[PDB]
């Protein structure tokens, strides 16, 4: 029986006796709770540190994967020799522990990374203060809180108390959260800013509409939970931002599901509010909850505004993007078919259309396709039987890898379909998607983001990416490998073509090399090349692309990978061959050891060891040792380090600062450069 309503609740017993308990049992032996404090004022550290102090809501609101403080007052002081209790968080009418909807929180000695637990951080008289840590994959919603005391006769639990109901939201500040955004200014704009601007008009007459998202106003968070209940969205999926944003794209429009907003373009808007009269999302959302029926009426920017409120309210970073000359493909062939024969012609173009982007990893897609995902709640085309759209990886759209779910071919057509005047009379390859914009961070100005959706018009890559997309919808094989790729060195990208036919072919291709975060979120393109090659019959040809250290070393970060796209067209047949692969750079190690006591004022020897990882000789090797408070900076030069050879460097020093210190070593030579090692040291 589906647990698909946050509003519904089950009734947990307060005296949960087990077996045939004898008359005359004395339960006074056991702890009972006299009071629970959540420290939930909007000035206190829970709501401030969780960035939830702005909600007009008197209950505790926290973000998942981050700890918060509560205090439990007991009937006598908690004594771990004789007493055992746990906190419980419960959601829905049919909670189940294996579905994440009944959450036991054990009292533990030390919090464990990523795991639910509560640590006692203070005991005074009858009270214990707990640091409670939630899982960064926690279901998002409004949970009921209980304290459960375990006895030989069963569990004794606190009564239902709506005043301790606790909202747990997505956490863009938590590095283990799927919606993690590592930039504070972007978090303020895309999560915490409750007003914004939606661009409209025409390419050469750009206008701006202010919009009040109002995600912190009284009732709005509860309405967003209500929207998911009205979707009959299983609670177990509400911790997954892919599922939340996709449900949101269906539910913000009224089609199919009694969603929030009824679309109309008829210039009359009978018995409703005309789409151009709204100036924000709050009135719409609150009317949906109070009337429990769709609100009339909206168009693209109103849908986007309300969808933006939904996403930001729940904690998914989100923004509104505007596409000038936005194509509406009606037959999913990824082009505008213009016959004007108004009866045969179904496809159309809007002066502008706008939709939302929501920020998240895509663990269902290969690494490289996380980050901004296009989601669209304006009804246009059905997606798997419902008016919804996305999340579509913007990075997948750019390279035409529209095979990756969801609805990427449609969004591609919106931003870059060709106009085909049809016998084919004429082709316009540059009209659709002339400019794509979103509000800038920290101002009302316009940010051009066209380049995130597509390559520049006129460039060969824009052609090659479009043919890839149409292919995803000659007897030549294409593959590529990265030859022995070591951090700090140039390396080769080897593209091989195998021609099994008797035909001579010409090939036009591009290469895109990108840095990617460990979670699969794209960071930056650092190399882009187009090239042409001739392919003799019955032959194999390898095309080696040199990737110099300078091209990527400036944009790396911890556990980053490299993401390569290669797309080649066989010109005589127009066949497309498109591959994408990621690789992790082999990382040279530098080992730091310390010998002797590490006391502030006595001498300790630091040993820096480095092994040449290459089959080539390193020359003019500079090793540096850094360690504020531990050593003045020092340097060692090695003229030559032979292949697979190890050098060792001993450096005496006397620390000037006690406590947890750090040693950092660096190595740079004429080829391999900027490889590091580190060691934490405690200085007694």
């Amino acid at each position: 029986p589906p647990n698909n309503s946050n509003a519904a609740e089950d009734d947990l017993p307060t005296v949960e006796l087990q077996g045939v308990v004898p008359r005359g049992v004395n339960l006074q032996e056991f702890l009972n709770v006299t009071s629970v404090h959540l420290f939930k004022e909007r000035w206190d550290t829970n709501k401030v540190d969780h960035h939830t102090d702005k909600y007009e809501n008197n209950k505790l609101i926290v973000r998942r994967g981050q700890s918060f403080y509560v205090q439990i007052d007991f009937s006598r002081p908690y004594d771990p020799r004789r007493d055992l209790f746990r906190v419980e968080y419960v959601i829905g009418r049919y909670p189940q522990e294996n579905k994440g909807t009944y959450i036991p929180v054990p009292i533990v000695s030390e919090l464990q990374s990523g795991k639910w637990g509560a640590k006692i951080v203070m005991r005074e008289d009858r009270s214990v203060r707990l640091s409670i840590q939630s899982s960064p994959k926690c279901i998002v919603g409004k949970f009921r809180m209980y304290v459960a005391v375990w006895t030989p006769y069963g569990v004794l639990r606190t009564s239902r108390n709506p005043e301790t109901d606790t909202y747990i939201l997505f956490n863009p500040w938590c590095e283990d959260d799927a919606v993690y955004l590592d930039n504070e200014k972007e978090r303020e704009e895309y999560v915490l800013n409750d007003i914004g601007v939606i661009f409209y008009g025409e390419v050469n007459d750009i206008k701006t509409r202010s919009w009040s998202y109002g995600q912190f106003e009284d009732g709005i968070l509860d309405t967003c939970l209500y929207v998911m209940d009205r979707a009959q969205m299983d609670l177990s999926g509400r911790g997954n931002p892919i599922k939340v944003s996709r449900v949101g794209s269906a539910m913000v429009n009224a089609k199919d599901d009694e969603g929030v907003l009824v679309g109309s373009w008829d210039n009359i808007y009978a018995y409703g509010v005309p789409p151009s009269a709204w100036t924000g999302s709050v009135d719409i959302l609150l009317e949906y909850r109070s009337s429990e029926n769709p609100v009339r009426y909206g168009q693209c920017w109103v849908f986007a505004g309300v969808f933006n409120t939904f996403l930001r309210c729940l904690g998914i970073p989100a923004r509104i993007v505007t596409n000038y000359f936005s194509a509406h493909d009606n037959d999913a062939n990824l082009q505008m078919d213009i016959f004007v024969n108004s009866k045969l012609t179904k496809d159309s173009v809007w002066n502008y259309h706008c939709w939302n982007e929501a920020w998240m990893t895509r663990p269902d897609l290969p690494v490289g396709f996380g980050g901004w995902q296009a989601v669209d709640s304006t009804p246009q085309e059905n997606s798997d039987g419902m008016y919804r759209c996305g999340p579509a990886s913007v990075q997948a759209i750019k390279h035409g890898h529209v095979c990756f779910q969801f609805d990427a071919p449609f969004v591609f057509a919106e931003v870059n379909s060709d106009l085909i005047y049809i016998v084919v009379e004429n082709v316009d390859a540059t009209h659709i998607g002339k400019l794509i914009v979103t509000k800038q961070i920290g101002g009302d100005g316009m940010m051009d983001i066209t380049d995130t959706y597509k390559f520049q018009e006129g460039q060969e890559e824009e052609r090659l990416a479009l043919e890839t997309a149409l292919m995803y919808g000659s007897n030549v094989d294409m593959d590529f490998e990265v030859e022995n790729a070591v951090l700090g060195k140039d390396f080769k990208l080897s593209i091989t073509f195998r021609n099994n036919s008797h035909n001579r072919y010409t090939i036009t291709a591009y290469l895109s090399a990108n840095i990617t975060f460990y979670t699969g979120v794209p960071k930056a393109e650092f190399k882009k090349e187009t090239f042409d090659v001739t392919l003799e019959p019955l032959s194999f040809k390898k095309e080696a692309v040199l990737i110099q250290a300078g091209e990527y070393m400036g944009q790396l970060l911890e556990q980053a990978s490299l993401h390569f796209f290669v797309t080649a067209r066989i010109n005589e047949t127009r066949d497309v061959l498109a591959k994408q692969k990621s690789t992790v750079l082999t990382i040279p190690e530098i080992i730091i050891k310390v010998r002797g006591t590490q006391v502030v004022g006595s001498d300790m020897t630091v040993i820096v060891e480095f092994t040449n990882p290459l089959k080539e000789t390193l020359r003019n090797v500079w090793v540096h040792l850094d360690g504020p408070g531990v050593t003045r900076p020092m340097k060692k030069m090695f003229r030559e380090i032979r292949p697979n050879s190890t050098v060792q460097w001993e450096e005496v020093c006397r620390p000037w600062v006690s406590g947890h210190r750090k040693l950092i070593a660096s190595m740079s030579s004429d080829s391999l450069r900027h490889v590091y090692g580190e060691l934490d040291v405690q200085i007694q």
């Binding site: 409209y200 008009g201 206008k207 373009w265 151009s276 168009q299 693209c300 920017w301 000359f325 505008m336 213009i338 004007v340 012609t345 159309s348 173009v349 809007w350 002066n351 502008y352 259309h353 106009l419």
Partner: peptide
């Protein structure tokens, strides 16, 4: 101000 622009 969405409007379909005729071809």
């Amino acid at each position: 101000x969405x409007l379909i622009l005729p071809w």
